[PDB]
């Protein structure tokens, strides 16, 4: 659980590598990430409580990234749930790869 959590939190930090002008909301996310990097068991207790009991979530933001020949939608989720989702993501991909869910033709794979 702590290895999966460290991977999730490193991935989430990777956004604000620049440590830019960011905003209030990214400031708040960095706060959550750091306090979960310090105290990793209140974090994981929260995470599993969420995964067990929660089924009505907050609202998502959308905006578009203009690539001049098409646009790309970009979704904006709130921090508490971003952490729960990042950990769920890591856990699912790890287990799926250990039990061999995806046969060898599903190919953005980690091998090449």
């Amino acid at each position: 659980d702590t290895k999966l959590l460290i991977l999730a939190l490193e991935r989430l930090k990777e956004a604000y590598s620049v440590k830019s002008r960011l905003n209030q909301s990214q400031r708040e996310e960095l706060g959550l990430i750091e306090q979960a990097y310090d105290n990793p068991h209140e974090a994981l207790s929260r995470i599993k409580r969420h995964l067990l009991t929660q089924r009505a979530f907050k609202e998502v933001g959308i905006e578009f990234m203009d690539l001049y020949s098409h646009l790309v939608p970009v979704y904006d989720v709130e921090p508490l749930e971003k952490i729960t989702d990042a950990y769920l993501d890591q856990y699912l991909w790890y287990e799926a790869d250990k039990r061999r869910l995806f046969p060898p033709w599903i190919k953005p794979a980690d091998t090449e």
């Binding site: 609202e59 959308i62 979704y75 989702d85 699912l92």
Partner: protein
């Protein structure tokens, strides 16, 4: 587990908001979630099966 399945599918059903327009996702998939890779590749697995057949 049914708990995680319910989390994952109850999480795609949220309210999407731009400046002052709001609606509810009820049909498709929000790709800006963090497990959306898993959903896309598993569903695509089901469709690989429909295209190839179980034997092949």
């Amino acid at each position: 587990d049914h708990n995680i399945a319910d989390y994952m599918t109850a999480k795609n059903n949220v309210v999407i908001n731009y400046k002052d327009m709001n609606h509810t996702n009820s049909y498709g998939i929000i790709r800006g979630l963090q497990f959306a890779s898993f959903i896309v590749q598993y569903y695509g697995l089901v469709m690989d099966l429909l295209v190839l057949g179980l034997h092949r």
